[PDB]
Amino acid sequence: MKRTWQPNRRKRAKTHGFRARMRTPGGRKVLKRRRQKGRWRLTPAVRK
Amino acid sequence: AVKKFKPYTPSRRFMTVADFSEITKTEPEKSLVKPLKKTGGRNNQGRITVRFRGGGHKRLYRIIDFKRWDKVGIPAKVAAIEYDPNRSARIALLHYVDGEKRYIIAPDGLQVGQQVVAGPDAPIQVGNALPLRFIPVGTVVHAVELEPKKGAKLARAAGTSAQIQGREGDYVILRLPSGELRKVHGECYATVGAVGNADHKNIVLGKAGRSRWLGRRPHVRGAAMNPVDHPHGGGEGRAPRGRPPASPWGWQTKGLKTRKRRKPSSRFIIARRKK
RNA sequence: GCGGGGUGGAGCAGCCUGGUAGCUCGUCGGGCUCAUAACCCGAAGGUCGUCGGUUCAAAUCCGGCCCCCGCAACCA
RNA sequence: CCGAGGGUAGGGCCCGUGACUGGGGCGAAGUCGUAACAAGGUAGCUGUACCGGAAGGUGCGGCUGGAU
RNA sequence: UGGGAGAGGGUGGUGGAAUUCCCGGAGUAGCGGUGAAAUGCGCAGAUACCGGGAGGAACGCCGAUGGCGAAGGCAGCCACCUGGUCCACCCGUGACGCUGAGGCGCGAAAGCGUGGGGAGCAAACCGGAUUAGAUACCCGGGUAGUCCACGCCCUAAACG
RNA sequence: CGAUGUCGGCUCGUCGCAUCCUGGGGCUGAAGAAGGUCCCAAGGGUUGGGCUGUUCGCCCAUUAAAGCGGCACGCGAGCUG
RNA sequence: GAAUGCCGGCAUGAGUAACGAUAAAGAGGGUGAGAAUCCCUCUCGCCGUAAGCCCAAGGGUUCCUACGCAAUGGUCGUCAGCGUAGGGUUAGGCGGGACCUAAGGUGAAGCCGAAAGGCGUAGCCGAAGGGCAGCCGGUUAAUAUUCCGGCCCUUCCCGCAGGUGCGAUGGGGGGACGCUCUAGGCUAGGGGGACCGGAGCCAUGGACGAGCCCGGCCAGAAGCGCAGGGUGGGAGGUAGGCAAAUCCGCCUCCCAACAAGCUCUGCGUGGUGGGGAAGCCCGGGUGACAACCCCCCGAAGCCAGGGAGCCAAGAAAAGCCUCUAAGCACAACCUGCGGGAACCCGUACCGCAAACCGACACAGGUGGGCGGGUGCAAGAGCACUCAGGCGCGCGGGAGAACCCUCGCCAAGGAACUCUGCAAGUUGGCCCCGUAACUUCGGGAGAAGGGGUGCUCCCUGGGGUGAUGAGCCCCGGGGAGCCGCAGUGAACAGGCUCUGGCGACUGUUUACCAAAAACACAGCUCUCUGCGAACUCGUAAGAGGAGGUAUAGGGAGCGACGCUUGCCCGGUGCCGGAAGGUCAAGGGGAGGGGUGCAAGCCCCGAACCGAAGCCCCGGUGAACGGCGGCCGUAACUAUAACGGUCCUAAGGUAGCGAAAUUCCUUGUCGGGUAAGUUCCGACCUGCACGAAAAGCGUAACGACCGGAGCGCUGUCUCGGCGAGGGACCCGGUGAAAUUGAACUGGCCGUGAAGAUGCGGCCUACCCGUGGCAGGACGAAAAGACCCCGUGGAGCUUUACUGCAGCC
RNA sequence: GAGCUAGCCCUGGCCAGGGUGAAGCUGGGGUGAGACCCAGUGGAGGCCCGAACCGGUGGGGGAUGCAAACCCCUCGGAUGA
Ligand SMILES: *C(=O)[C@H](CCSC)NC=O
Ligand SMILES: [K+]
Ligand SMILES: [Mg+2]
Ligand SMILES: [Mg+2]
Ligand SMILES: [Mg+2]
Ligand SMILES: [Mg+2]
Ligand SMILES: [Mg+2]
Ligand SMILES: [Mg+2]
Ligand SMILES: [Mg+2]
Ligand SMILES: [Mg+2]
Ligand SMILES: [Mg+2]
Ligand SMILES: [Mg+2]
Ligand SMILES: [Mg+2]
Ligand SMILES: [Mg+2]
Ligand SMILES: [Mg+2]
Ligand SMILES: [Mg+2]
Ligand SMILES: [Mg+2]
Ligand SMILES: [Mg+2]
Ligand SMILES: [Mg+2]
Ligand SMILES: [Mg+2]
Ligand SMILES: [Mg+2]
Ligand SMILES: [Mg+2]
Ligand SMILES: [Mg+2]
Ligand SMILES: [Mg+2]
Ligand SMILES: [Mg+2]
Ligand SMILES: [Mg+2]
Ligand SMILES: [Mg+2]
Ligand SMILES: [Mg+2]
Ligand SMILES: [Mg+2]
Ligand SMILES: [Mg+2]
Ligand SMILES: [Mg+2]
Ligand SMILES: [Mg+2]
Ligand SMILES: [Mg+2]
Ligand SMILES: [Mg+2]
Ligand SMILES: [Mg+2]
Ligand SMILES: [Mg+2]
Ligand SMILES: [Mg+2]
Ligand SMILES: [Mg+2]
Ligand SMILES: [Mg+2]
Ligand SMILES: [Mg+2]
Ligand SMILES: [Mg+2]
Ligand SMILES: [Mg+2]
Ligand SMILES: [Mg+2]
Ligand SMILES: [Mg+2]
Ligand SMILES: [Mg+2]
Ligand SMILES: [Mg+2]
Ligand SMILES: [Mg+2]
Ligand SMILES: [Mg+2]
Ligand SMILES: [Mg+2]
Ligand SMILES: [Mg+2]
Ligand SMILES: [Mg+2]
Ligand SMILES: [Mg+2]
Ligand SMILES: [Mg+2]
Ligand SMILES: [Mg+2]
Ligand SMILES: [Mg+2]
Ligand SMILES: [Mg+2]
Ligand SMILES: [Mg+2]
Ligand SMILES: [Mg+2]
Ligand SMILES: [Mg+2]
Ligand SMILES: [Mg+2]
Ligand SMILES: [Mg+2]
Ligand SMILES: [Mg+2]
Ligand SMILES: [Mg+2]
Ligand SMILES: [Mg+2]
Ligand SMILES: [Mg+2]
Ligand SMILES: [Mg+2]
Ligand SMILES: [Mg+2]
Ligand SMILES: [Mg+2]
Ligand SMILES: [Mg+2]
Ligand SMILES: [Mg+2]
Ligand SMILES: [Mg+2]
Ligand SMILES: [Mg+2]
Ligand SMILES: [Mg+2]
Ligand SMILES: [Mg+2]
Ligand SMILES: [Mg+2]
Ligand SMILES: [Mg+2]
Ligand SMILES: [Mg+2]
Ligand SMILES: [Mg+2]
Ligand SMILES: [Mg+2]
Ligand SMILES: [Mg+2]
Ligand SMILES: [Mg+2]
Ligand SMILES: [Mg+2]
Ligand SMILES: [Mg+2]
Ligand SMILES: [Mg+2]
Ligand SMILES: [Mg+2]
Ligand SMILES: [Mg+2]
Ligand SMILES: [Mg+2]
Ligand SMILES: [Mg+2]
Ligand SMILES: [Mg+2]
Ligand SMILES: [Mg+2]
Ligand SMILES: [Mg+2]
Ligand SMILES: [Mg+2]
Ligand SMILES: [Mg+2]
Ligand SMILES: [Mg+2]
Ligand SMILES: [Mg+2]
Ligand SMILES: [Mg+2]
Ligand SMILES: [Mg+2]
Ligand SMILES: [Mg+2]
Ligand SMILES: [Mg+2]
Ligand SMILES: [Mg+2]
Ligand SMILES: [Mg+2]
Ligand SMILES: [Mg+2]
Ligand SMILES: [Mg+2]
Ligand SMILES: [Mg+2]
Ligand SMILES: [Mg+2]
Ligand SMILES: [Mg+2]
Ligand SMILES: [Mg+2]
Ligand SMILES: [Mg+2]
Ligand SMILES: [Mg+2]
Ligand SMILES: [Mg+2]
Ligand SMILES: [Mg+2]
Ligand SMILES: [Mg+2]
Ligand SMILES: [Mg+2]
Ligand SMILES: [Mg+2]
Ligand SMILES: [Mg+2]
Ligand SMILES: [Mg+2]
Ligand SMILES: [Mg+2]
Ligand SMILES: [Mg+2]
Ligand SMILES: [Mg+2]
Ligand SMILES: [Mg+2]
Ligand SMILES: [Mg+2]
Ligand SMILES: [Mg+2]
Ligand SMILES: [Mg+2]
Ligand SMILES: [Mg+2]
Ligand SMILES: [Mg+2]
Ligand SMILES: [Mg+2]
Ligand SMILES: [Mg+2]
Ligand SMILES: [Mg+2]
Ligand SMILES: [Mg+2]
Ligand SMILES: [Mg+2]
Ligand SMILES: [Mg+2]
Ligand SMILES: [Mg+2]
Ligand SMILES: [Mg+2]
Ligand SMILES: [Mg+2]
Ligand SMILES: [Mg+2]
Ligand SMILES: [Mg+2]
Ligand SMILES: [Mg+2]
Ligand SMILES: [Mg+2]
Ligand SMILES: [Mg+2]
Ligand SMILES: [Mg+2]
Ligand SMILES: [Mg+2]
Ligand SMILES: [Mg+2]
Ligand SMILES: [Mg+2]
Ligand SMILES: [Mg+2]
Ligand SMILES: [Mg+2]
Ligand SMILES: [Mg+2]
Ligand SMILES: [Mg+2]
Ligand SMILES: [Mg+2]
Ligand SMILES: [Mg+2]
Ligand SMILES: [Mg+2]
Ligand SMILES: [Mg+2]
Ligand SMILES: [Mg+2]
Ligand SMILES: [Mg+2]
Ligand SMILES: [Mg+2]
Ligand SMILES: [Mg+2]
Ligand SMILES: [Mg+2]
Ligand SMILES: [Mg+2]
Ligand SMILES: [Mg+2]
Ligand SMILES: [Mg+2]
Ligand SMILES: [Mg+2]
Ligand SMILES: [Mg+2]
Ligand SMILES: [Mg+2]
Ligand SMILES: [Mg+2]
Ligand SMILES: [Mg+2]
Ligand SMILES: [Mg+2]
Ligand SMILES: [Mg+2]
Ligand SMILES: [Mg+2]
Ligand SMILES: [Mg+2]
Ligand SMILES: [Mg+2]
Ligand SMILES: [Mg+2]
Ligand SMILES: [Mg+2]
Ligand SMILES: [Mg+2]
Ligand SMILES: [Mg+2]
Ligand SMILES: [Mg+2]
Ligand SMILES: [Mg+2]
Ligand SMILES: [Mg+2]
Ligand SMILES: [Mg+2]
Ligand SMILES: [Mg+2]
Ligand SMILES: [Mg+2]
Ligand SMILES: [Mg+2]
Ligand SMILES: [Mg+2]
Ligand SMILES: [Mg+2]
Ligand SMILES: [Mg+2]
Ligand SMILES: [Mg+2]
Ligand SMILES: [Mg+2]
Ligand SMILES: [Mg+2]
Ligand SMILES: [Mg+2]
Ligand SMILES: [Mg+2]
Ligand SMILES: [Mg+2]
Ligand SMILES: [Mg+2]
Ligand SMILES: [Mg+2]
Ligand SMILES: [Mg+2]
Ligand SMILES: [Mg+2]
Ligand SMILES: [Mg+2]
Ligand SMILES: [Mg+2]
Ligand SMILES: [Mg+2]
Ligand SMILES: [Mg+2]
Ligand SMILES: [Mg+2]
Ligand SMILES: [Mg+2]
Ligand SMILES: [Mg+2]
Ligand SMILES: [Mg+2]
Ligand SMILES: [Mg+2]
Ligand SMILES: [Mg+2]
Ligand SMILES: [Mg+2]
Ligand SMILES: [Mg+2]
Ligand SMILES: [Mg+2]
Ligand SMILES: [Mg+2]
Ligand SMILES: [Mg+2]
Ligand SMILES: [Mg+2]
Ligand SMILES: [Mg+2]
Ligand SMILES: [Mg+2]
Ligand SMILES: [Mg+2]
Ligand SMILES: [Mg+2]
Ligand SMILES: [Mg+2]
Ligand SMILES: [Mg+2]
Ligand SMILES: [Mg+2]
Ligand SMILES: [Mg+2]
Ligand SMILES: [Mg+2]
Ligand SMILES: [Mg+2]
Ligand SMILES: [Mg+2]
Ligand SMILES: [Mg+2]
Ligand SMILES: [Mg+2]
Ligand SMILES: [Mg+2]
Ligand SMILES: [Mg+2]
Ligand SMILES: [Mg+2]
Ligand SMILES: [Mg+2]
Ligand SMILES: [Mg+2]
Ligand SMILES: [Mg+2]
Ligand SMILES: [Mg+2]
Ligand SMILES: [Mg+2]
C-alpha cells in the first residue's frame, strides 16, 4: 500500500534544512547540539 | 419567483432555484472585481475559528459602494443588474455621468436604465441615497450607515429593509430588519427602498450537494460526539441532552443572552428585537 | 436482600414526640318532594393485621409470625 | 399454414370464505347522565373546526323553522 | 345617441373614533369582575386623569322597511381600472330567440399550503366559580384562527 | 490467573448399564392377540424431517426401536463460530 | 546457575518448511576448468489501454565497454543493476534561473508580547499557473529539438535608413479564466485499393492469378489557398480612472454594421532537405533511380480567447498595446536592413519498477502523454494478434493420502446449514410484453417471452463524392443451407412476494463493525444591531465577513405526509430600579496600647454599601415529569358511572408480545406434512408515545428478517478428472521451541488429571509417509476476576483551585 | 513531526462507451385570453448500466504470508458532497 516515506527534495530541504533550522530558536539549538555532539552533517542530505 | 423542478431525480423533487429574471448582465465589470480570498474559516493562526466551512465555488468579489456620499449630486444611470455570489441581494451597475462605474446593491423595483442620485436634496425615489435626516419619516429604506461616514452597515441582505419611525435631536429612529428599535444619527446615509431579491428565502437547497457548493461543510451534532468533544457527547445509545443544552465550549445555548451589558450603544437601542 | 405499609363498610389522618383515635364517603333515623336524587338536621360504627415484650399506661416504642406495595438480584 | 386443446407466465371482473375489526338494525321492565320538544331552564338549527364517558360543548359564519 | 341611481367588482392611497401596549407626567389603595364571589391585576405605585409613541383591525352618526349583484356577498374617504342595470329618443341589424345534459367559471364561514402580520377577539387549552358531577353555561387568562398576499378546499337553514 | 479456549453444531468414536429395540425369563387383575411389572442380558441396532444458536423440548412422517449417561457438560495444535 | 537477565558464541527443530504469482517449455550450435541457468539459431508459450513507448517525481553512475566470479543473485553462473578499470551526459530556441504573480511565506512603515518571540499594508520571495524564440533527419559502444545537415526563429548591443512628441515603477486597455452540451473546417491516427514500387514464391490435391507476401511517406520559410479567432470608424463635450493625459470611462452626432477591411493562428501547398519495406545476404549492405498515388473512417487533439445553455457565477501579475509626467526634444522611441553579442544549472541511466516508496531483485503502492488491427451494438470492455517486450533467477521425476484452484456427474433438488454460506441459474443486443402501489418521475431490465449463424435474390435511406460510380453507415422483404447448439469462443443480471430500519446520492471505526451509526436537504428553539455574537490568541491581531437579521453563531430533530397533548412545584434560561442577604470601601457610638504632655498607634457598634443568592413572575421543538386503592350494569363477565387518597400534572392522538413484552414459543389467525423465526390480529404496554419526536410513507439499500419459483455437489453421498503442492532425486537451506531425557498401557497414589511414584500388563534396535488424543503442547509475565491507600480517559448539584464572564 | 493520515488554501489534470430523456424552444390543438394537451426539437440530473479511477460487500485462500492487511472470485460509486 502507500507507505509513509514519500521523498521530495523540496519538502526535505524546506522542512529540515539548514535555513529552516537557523530561523527558529529550537532549530538553532539543534544545530548547536549537533555541532556539540560532532555530527558529520547538521542537516539531512538532499540534492536539490 | 423561485423555479421548481420535476422530480426526475430524488433531489430535484424539492430543489428550487432563483428565477434570475431581473439579471440583465451575466459577467461582472472587470474594473470592479477582485479575488475573494477563501479562508475556510481558518484565521491567520491557521486555526479553524469558524467551524464547518470550505470547498465552495470559486468567487470574485464585486466591490460595492457602501458610501455614495462619495458622489453627492452626480447622477448615475442604471446600466445593469447582476448576480453577486458574495451576497443574497442582487447588485446594480451604475454608470455615473462622471464616467465612473460603481456597484450598489439593488433595491426592490429598481429598473435598468433609470437614474439615481445621492445627497441631501435627492428625490425620494427607489435607489437614491440621502442622509437619514432628510428622508421623510415613515419611509422604507435600506443600506443604512450606523455612524456617519463609516459605511452602510444595516439592511443589506436580500429583501430586507429598515423603516424610519421618527426623529429625536440629531438622531432618527429606525425599525431594523430584526425589529429592534434603534436611534441612528441623522447624518447617516441610507437608500430609499427595500433590498431586492425578496424571494431569496423561498429557495429550497434541495440536497446536501447545494450546501457543499456554498462552502458549507457538514455540521455534526454535539449529541453525535464523545465527551472529549462536546457537552452533549457520549451516552449509551441515543441520549437526551441530560444537562442544559450547550455549545462545544460549554455555554448554554437555549436562551442565554450574550450582548455585553455595559456596551455604549445601549444608550441608543430603544427596544430589543421582535420575535 | 433493602425500604415502606396493614386502624369503623370504602379510601386516608393519628405513630415520629406513649395517656387524646380524626377527615371525606358510605350506613342508620328524621326532614323537603306527589316520588326519587341532590340537599338539610341528628345518629351508629374502629377497638388499631396478629402473637410476644417495654411501661402505671401501647394504634403509637422494641422483637417474631402473617399478608400487601416498591426497589434490587450485578462481574465473568 | 391454420387448428381442438395442452403447458408456462402475467393480468382483469365476479363469488364464497377469514383471526380480528367497524359501525348499523332490532330486542317488556339494565347503568350513566338530561341534549332536544316550554325561552326545555345557555333560543334552536346549521356547514366547518377543535375538544370531551356519552348525549354534547365551544369558536367562526349563516338561517328563523326563534321565544319575547 | 343622450342621460341616471347604486356598500356591484379589482388596484392604489388616505382620515378619524376606540382598544391594547410602550414612554413621561400627576397621583394613592385599590382596581377588576359577578347572581354573589374568586381567580387575576395593584405600594416593585395598579386603577382613574393629562401629554407623547407604536401597531393592527373594524368603519359610529348618515343608515332606512333603503341601494347594488347571478348567487355567495358588498358600508369611512379619495383616485384609477371595470361589470351590470334602468330610462328617454324610436335612429340601425331583421327572429340573430328560449332553455340548456356535458363543460367551464364564481362560490359565506370554517379548514389547508407558503410567506407576512397580530391591537381587539377567540376554538383548543389553563385557572376561578357553580354543581352530585360541570370535560358546560358565568369569570380571569389564552394558542391557532380571525387580517394581508398567492395557491387550494367547493360545503351550508348556499333560504324566498 | 509468566493462560487448563467455554455453548451448540460437524466429524470420529469409545465406554457404562440404572435396557429404548432385538434374545431369554418369572408374576399378572395373563383367554387369544396385545399390554403391565420385575428378573437376565451391553452382541448388534437405535431413522428422515419443520421450529429455534440452541442442548432440551414441541411437532410431522415413519420405525423393531426412535434409550439414558461417562469420556476436561469427549473431541476448536480436527472443522465450524 | 537461574533475574522471559545482558553481550557474544554455538546447538535443537532439519537436510525439514521454503526457494516469492501455474505465462512453459524443447533441441541444436557456441564459449568455458566448470553450463537446465551465459551467448547464437530454430521451435514452443505469455503481455499487447501492456507485461510495449514517452515524460514527471524519486534514485544517483545503476548507463557503455574491457576484464573478472570471493561475496551479493533465494539454485547454478562463464551471466549481472555485482567487483576492477576506462569511457560516456555538449542547448540563445528543451526544462529552470538572469521575467511574472497564486496560496502561503517573508516583511521598510506600524502594532503587540517578561525574554525567546507574535503579528503586519506595501515591497520582496514563492509554480506543474501566466509569459517566452526549433522542426525533420543523420551520427556514437554510450548524448543529442543539445553534435552534424537542411530549413527557420528570439533577445541584447552598435551602426545606417526612414518615421514619430519621445519619455513610467504612474493612468488605461489587455492578459483574464467556471460547468455541461456543442457547430464548421481541419490535423493525429486508421481501413481499403483491380492503382504505383519490390526481392521473390507456386508448395501437398488446385491456382502463373485483376494471385500471395511487402511497401506506398516526413519536415519545410516567404507567397498563395482553405478554415477560424480577435477587432468598428470619425467627430464634439468631459467634472471620472487620487498629478498629467490626445489614452480609457460617460454623453451626443455622422458613417460603417449580420459583412467587408486590418490583424492573428491552425491546416493545406510550398523553394528545399530527408526518409524509404518485405525478402536475400554479411548492426550493415542489397532491394532502389524504390514507389511515394487514389478512396473511405476520423478524434476527446487544432483553428480558440469558437458557439449554446445553466447557476453554484467561475485567480493574479508581468510580457504586450495605448496615455501621458518629470525630463529631453545633438536626445528618445517606432519600423526596416546590417554587423556584432547571447551567461548559469539540468541533460547519462532505471522510471507501474530488480534501479522509486515498501528492511528483500518483496504477487503491495506510485502522477501525466501515446496505446495499432480484427471481430463481438458500442468502448480504453473481451478474445486473438502488430510494433515491441517477455516465459516471472532452482531444476528433474513421480502420478499416494490430504490441501488448494478447476471441470463433470445417475436419481433427487435446500432434504445442507445460524443462513442457499458457497456454487449453480440468469447473463449482450433487437423485438413483443410488463402488476400492486406511487410523491406520477417512477416502480422497470419488473415479471415473461420470441429473435440472433450462413447463402442466394429483391429493395428503402444517409455520409462522401457530383446529382453518378466506388467506398462507408443505418435498415426492409422473399427463398434457402447446416449443426445438439448461431451474443456457437471470451466479456455481460437470477427472479418474485412480504416485513423491520434508514427517505434518498453520500460518510465511517487506515489494519476484525459500512450498519439501523454519521452526514444530508428540511423543521424548530436560541443567541447576535456590527468594533455583532461566537471562535483562536497573554496581547496585537485574525477568523466571523470586506458578510449585516432573507445575515452569522449554537442546539435538537432529520425528505415528504398527517401530527406533536397535560405539568413551570424542582433545575436551567428570560424578565423584575421594592424587600431580604451580601465584600472591599464609607462611616466612627465607643473602647485599647503608649507618652509629662501636645501627639503618635491599635481595635471598633449602628449606618450608607455591587454583582451573586434569596424572593416575585415567565418559559418545554429548555433540564425534565406525566398516580394509587375500592365500588358499580336485570345471567355471567367487564365497567360508560361513582367513592377516596395523592401530585406541579397523572400518558392525549397514534402505535403496541414491537430493533421495546419479563412471564413468552402469550393467544388466535395465515403460511408449512410439521413454523421458538415470519406475517396479520388481540391488548394486563414487566418497562411505546409524540422534534433523545409519534404514526405512516413511493423510491432507494453490498443493511437485518420471512416465504416462493428457477437452478444447483449445499446435502442424500459420494465418485472421477486437471493443474500447483504434498512424495522421490540433484542444488540452496530457515523458524518458533528447547532444564536435561535412556520420554509405553492400565489401575492406583501423589499439590486433587503421572512417560518420570507403586503394582501389574505390554514392549527387539532405527527410520519414512500420514493423523492429531496427550505431553495440563507453542505463542502472549490472563484482556475476565480480585488485590495495589498503582495509573490514565470520562462525568457530576464530590473537593479545592484556575481560565473566562459578571 | 501533517513527505502517513484528517481538514482546508492555491494551481493543474482525469472521468472509455452505452441508456434514460427534465425544463426551454418550435409547430399543432385548445380558449375570450389562458391554463393545459400532442408531436418534434432539446440534452437536464449528488439519473441508469459499465471500463479507467476511487472503493472494500460476501466467500475462499494466505496466517514464521508475495504482503506488519496481500491474492482470487464477487460486489459499491463512477458529472460528483
Ligand atoms: C469472560 O467472558 C471473559 C471474556 C472477556 S470480555 C472483556 N473471558 C474469560 O475467560
Ligand atoms: K465488565
Ligand atoms: Mg506525497
Ligand atoms: Mg520537489
Ligand atoms: Mg514540497
Ligand atoms: Mg530549509
Ligand atoms: Mg550519521
Ligand atoms: Mg566531516
Ligand atoms: Mg538538523
Ligand atoms: Mg484587474
Ligand atoms: Mg499568516
Ligand atoms: Mg505562522
Ligand atoms: Mg466556530
Ligand atoms: Mg459558493
Ligand atoms: Mg448534523
Ligand atoms: Mg454519541
Ligand atoms: Mg459515539
Ligand atoms: Mg481531542
Ligand atoms: Mg465535558
Ligand atoms: Mg450527555
Ligand atoms: Mg450517544
Ligand atoms: Mg437508552
Ligand atoms: Mg452512541
Ligand atoms: Mg434533551
Ligand atoms: Mg436526563
Ligand atoms: Mg460569553
Ligand atoms: Mg407520622
Ligand atoms: Mg298520583
Ligand atoms: Mg331523598
Ligand atoms: Mg401493654
Ligand atoms: Mg401489646
Ligand atoms: Mg403520640
Ligand atoms: Mg459492570
Ligand atoms: Mg391436448
Ligand atoms: Mg335539556
Ligand atoms: Mg342546548
Ligand atoms: Mg339544562
Ligand atoms: Mg337550551
Ligand atoms: Mg371519563
Ligand atoms: Mg370546551
Ligand atoms: Mg415603596
Ligand atoms: Mg323604428
Ligand atoms: Mg343560459
Ligand atoms: Mg369558498
Ligand atoms: Mg376564510
Ligand atoms: Mg375550570
Ligand atoms: Mg345539579
Ligand atoms: Mg335568508
Ligand atoms: Mg487462570
Ligand atoms: Mg510461559
Ligand atoms: Mg502460554
Ligand atoms: Mg488461548
Ligand atoms: Mg384379556
Ligand atoms: Mg399374550
Ligand atoms: Mg422377577
Ligand atoms: Mg446391547
Ligand atoms: Mg452402546
Ligand atoms: Mg432443536
Ligand atoms: Mg447441556
Ligand atoms: Mg428450549
Ligand atoms: Mg413391539
Ligand atoms: Mg443413565
Ligand atoms: Mg457438569
Ligand atoms: Mg454431551
Ligand atoms: Mg469442545
Ligand atoms: Mg479454532
Ligand atoms: Mg467447539
Ligand atoms: Mg490446542
Ligand atoms: Mg491441545
Ligand atoms: Mg541461585
Ligand atoms: Mg527468551
Ligand atoms: Mg531482567
Ligand atoms: Mg542477553
Ligand atoms: Mg542449526
Ligand atoms: Mg529428505
Ligand atoms: Mg519432521
Ligand atoms: Mg517456511
Ligand atoms: Mg511461494
Ligand atoms: Mg525441441
Ligand atoms: Mg549455467
Ligand atoms: Mg557452471
Ligand atoms: Mg542466449
Ligand atoms: Mg489491442
Ligand atoms: Mg536507494
Ligand atoms: Mg560469485
Ligand atoms: Mg566459481
Ligand atoms: Mg577476484
Ligand atoms: Mg549469493
Ligand atoms: Mg550463488
Ligand atoms: Mg531472493
Ligand atoms: Mg571462463
Ligand atoms: Mg542550438
Ligand atoms: Mg544579464
Ligand atoms: Mg516577484
Ligand atoms: Mg520562498
Ligand atoms: Mg514557470
Ligand atoms: Mg489561470
Ligand atoms: Mg522556455
Ligand atoms: Mg532524430
Ligand atoms: Mg535616422
Ligand atoms: Mg507617446
Ligand atoms: Mg507603461
Ligand atoms: Mg477575472
Ligand atoms: Mg451546471
Ligand atoms: Mg501534419
Ligand atoms: Mg479503420
Ligand atoms: Mg497502403
Ligand atoms: Mg534503408
Ligand atoms: Mg542503389
Ligand atoms: Mg518640463
Ligand atoms: Mg538637441
Ligand atoms: Mg509611432
Ligand atoms: Mg550572470
Ligand atoms: Mg540527453
Ligand atoms: Mg503511468
Ligand atoms: Mg527494471
Ligand atoms: Mg533495490
Ligand atoms: Mg519503513
Ligand atoms: Mg525475482
Ligand atoms: Mg514489485
Ligand atoms: Mg462474428
Ligand atoms: Mg460489445
Ligand atoms: Mg516460468
Ligand atoms: Mg506477470
Ligand atoms: Mg521463479
Ligand atoms: Mg517440481
Ligand atoms: Mg511420488
Ligand atoms: Mg447431480
Ligand atoms: Mg426445487
Ligand atoms: Mg426442480
Ligand atoms: Mg431452507
Ligand atoms: Mg434465510
Ligand atoms: Mg450467494
Ligand atoms: Mg453461472
Ligand atoms: Mg405512475
Ligand atoms: Mg428481460
Ligand atoms: Mg456456418
Ligand atoms: Mg455471460
Ligand atoms: Mg447487469
Ligand atoms: Mg419482527
Ligand atoms: Mg442510508
Ligand atoms: Mg444510517
Ligand atoms: Mg423513519
Ligand atoms: Mg420518511
Ligand atoms: Mg459512523
Ligand atoms: Mg475496521
Ligand atoms: Mg478497529
Ligand atoms: Mg492501524
Ligand atoms: Mg472484514
Ligand atoms: Mg458497526
Ligand atoms: Mg454499504
Ligand atoms: Mg422536517
Ligand atoms: Mg480562547
Ligand atoms: Mg474581511
Ligand atoms: Mg447557522
Ligand atoms: Mg431524511
Ligand atoms: Mg443525522
Ligand atoms: Mg437523530
Ligand atoms: Mg401520503
Ligand atoms: Mg416545571
Ligand atoms: Mg421554572
Ligand atoms: Mg415558576
Ligand atoms: Mg444586590
Ligand atoms: Mg425537549
Ligand atoms: Mg423531575
Ligand atoms: Mg354486575
Ligand atoms: Mg391529554
Ligand atoms: Mg390530541
Ligand atoms: Mg402487544
Ligand atoms: Mg411472536
Ligand atoms: Mg418496553
Ligand atoms: Mg430473561
Ligand atoms: Mg416475548
Ligand atoms: Mg423472547
Ligand atoms: Mg410463538
Ligand atoms: Mg407456538
Ligand atoms: Mg396455520
Ligand atoms: Mg430472527
Ligand atoms: Mg394479553
Ligand atoms: Mg430529549
Ligand atoms: Mg430513545
Ligand atoms: Mg414506522
Ligand atoms: Mg416503504
Ligand atoms: Mg420506509
Ligand atoms: Mg444504503
Ligand atoms: Mg446497504
Ligand atoms: Mg436487501
Ligand atoms: Mg463436494
Ligand atoms: Mg493432480
Ligand atoms: Mg546459496
Ligand atoms: Mg538428564
Ligand atoms: Mg538421558
Ligand atoms: Mg482427590
Ligand atoms: Mg493418575
Ligand atoms: Mg525412574
Ligand atoms: Mg518411591
Ligand atoms: Mg514407576
Ligand atoms: Mg497392558
Ligand atoms: Mg522424506
Ligand atoms: Mg513425516
Ligand atoms: Mg496430538
Ligand atoms: Mg488437537
Ligand atoms: Mg495436521
Ligand atoms: Mg494436547
Ligand atoms: Mg499471540
Ligand atoms: Mg512484566
Ligand atoms: Mg500476571
Ligand atoms: Mg498480558
Ligand atoms: Mg477473582
Ligand atoms: Mg484510600
Ligand atoms: Mg493499603
Ligand atoms: Mg489512584
Ligand atoms: Mg485505579
Ligand atoms: Mg487521573
Ligand atoms: Mg497532505
Ligand atoms: Mg504530501
Ligand atoms: Mg481542475
Ligand atoms: Mg488518461
Ligand atoms: Mg465518471
Ligand atoms: Mg460518454
Ligand atoms: Mg445525459
Ligand atoms: Mg450518475
Ligand atoms: Mg475484500
Ligand atoms: Mg461468493
Ligand atoms: Mg494477517
Ligand atoms: Mg513466529
Ligand atoms: Mg475481481
Ligand atoms: Mg459492478
Ligand atoms: Mg461515466
Ligand atoms: Mg455504475
CB atoms within 10 A of CB B190: 28
> What spacing in Å lies between the alpha carbon of A2 and ligand 201's midpoint?
43
Sign of CA dihedral B52, B153, B144, B99: negative
* Alpha carbon separation from B106 to B71, B82, B99, B183 (Å, rounded): 18, 9, 20, 25
> What one-character-per-residue DSSP string does B145-171 give?
ESSTTS-EEES-STT--EEEEEEETTE
**CA gap A13, B179 in Å, rounded:** 59
Breaks (C-N over 2.5 A) in chain B follow: none
**Which nucleotides on strand H sit less than 7 A from a protein beta carbon?**
1-5, 7-11, 22-23, 44-47, 69-70, 80-81
Resolution (A): 2.6
Q: Which three cell numbers stand for residue B104?
A: 450598489
CA of B31 to the centre of ligand 102 (A): 18
Burial of residue B195 (CB within 10 Å: 0-12, 13-18, 19+) is buried
**Which residue has cell 539543534?**
A30
Using alpha carbons only, what angle is made at residue B240 by residues B239 and B244, rounded to the nearest 5 degrees? 135
- Say how many Å lie between the CA of residue B33 and the centre of ligand 80: 76
Number of neighbours of residue B122 by Cβ within 10 angstroms:
22
What technique solved it? X-ray
Report the b/e string of B61-80 with b at 16+ CB within 10 A.
ebebbbbbbebeeebbebbb
Please check whether strand G approaches the CB of A26 to within 7 Å: no
Place of cell 432563483: B18
Is residue B215 within 8 A of residue B41, CB to CB? The reply is: no
The dihedral built from the CA positions of residue B5, B213, B112 and B155, taken in this order, carries a sign that is: positive
Identify the helix (H) or strand (E) that includes residue B212: helix B208-213
> Distance, CA B38 to ligand 177 centroid (Å)?
68
Whose grid coordinates read 422530480?
Answer: B7
Phi-psi region of B171 (alpha: psi -120 to 50; beta: other; left: phi over 0): beta
**Strand E proximity list, CB < 7 Å:** B 163, 165-166, 179, 201-202, 274-275
Q: Does the CB of B267 fall within 7 Å of any strand G atom?
A: no
